[PDB]
């Protein structure tokens, strides 16, 4: 509250560390469904159904342009990529499995870097 603060966590490396994690996600072999924005002209249903599209290239652009106020907003966008994937894809499909694998990969990197 006013004039009552928890001890100051050092957040000066967060930007660099989020960038590294994003690089690691981008270079994973199962990243291919998530690297670029879904083509809303060519994928039936996607525009209507997925209210907030998100992808790794868009996260990169946001990150590099100071559009994440903190590391939780970054994590929220990454999770949005996978939540979208689950909404639109059967679990039993290549893309469905890709999204599960990537989400796990991310959550491990996140816990190991910050938790």
From Swiss-Prot:
Transmembrane segments: none annotated. It is found in: Nucleus. It comes from the Eukaryota. Residues 9-113 form the Bromo domain. Expressed at varying levels in several tissues, whereas a smaller transcript was expressed specifically in testis. Regulatory subunit of the ATP-dependent BRF-1 and BRF-5 ISWI chromatin remodeling complexes, which form ordered nucleosome arrays on chromatin and facilitate access to DNA during DNA-templated processes such as DNA replication, transcription, and repair. Both complexes regulate the spacing of nucleosomes along the chromatin and have the ability to slide mononucleosomes to the center of a DNA template. The BRF-1 ISWI chromatin remodeling complex has a lower ATP hydrolysis rate than the BRF-5 ISWI chromatin remodeling complex. Component of the BRF-1 ISWI chromatin remodeling complex, at least composed of SMARCA1 and BAZ2B, which regulates the spacing of histone octamers on the DNA template to facilitate access to DNA. Within the BRF-1 ISWI chromatin remodeling complex interacts with SMARCA1; the interaction is direct. Component of the BRF-5 ISWI chromatin remodeling complex, at least composed of SMARCA5/SNF2H and BAZ2B, which regulates the spacing of histone octamers on the DNA template to facilitate access to DNA. Belongs to the WAL family. This is Bromodomain adjacent to zinc finger domain protein 2B. It comes from Homo sapiens (Human). The gene is BAZ2B. The chain holds residues 2054 to 2166 of 2168 of the full protein.
């Amino acid at each position: 509250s006013m004039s009552v603060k928890k001890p100051k966590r050092d957040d000066s490396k967060d930007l660099a560390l989020c960038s590294m994690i994003l690089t690691e996600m981008e270079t994973h072999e199962d990243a291919w469904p998530f690297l670029l924005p879904v083509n809303l002209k060519l994928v039936p249903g996607y525009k209507k159904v997925i209210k907030k599209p998100m992808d790794f290239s868009t996260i990169r652009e946001k990150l590099s342009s100071g559009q994440y106020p903190n590391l939780e907003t970054f994590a929220l966008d990454v999770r949005l990529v996978f939540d979208n994937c689950e909404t639109f894809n059967e679990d039993d499909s290549d893309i469905g499995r890709a999204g599960h694998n990537m989400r796990k990969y991310f959550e491990k990197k996140w816990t190991d870097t910050f938790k």
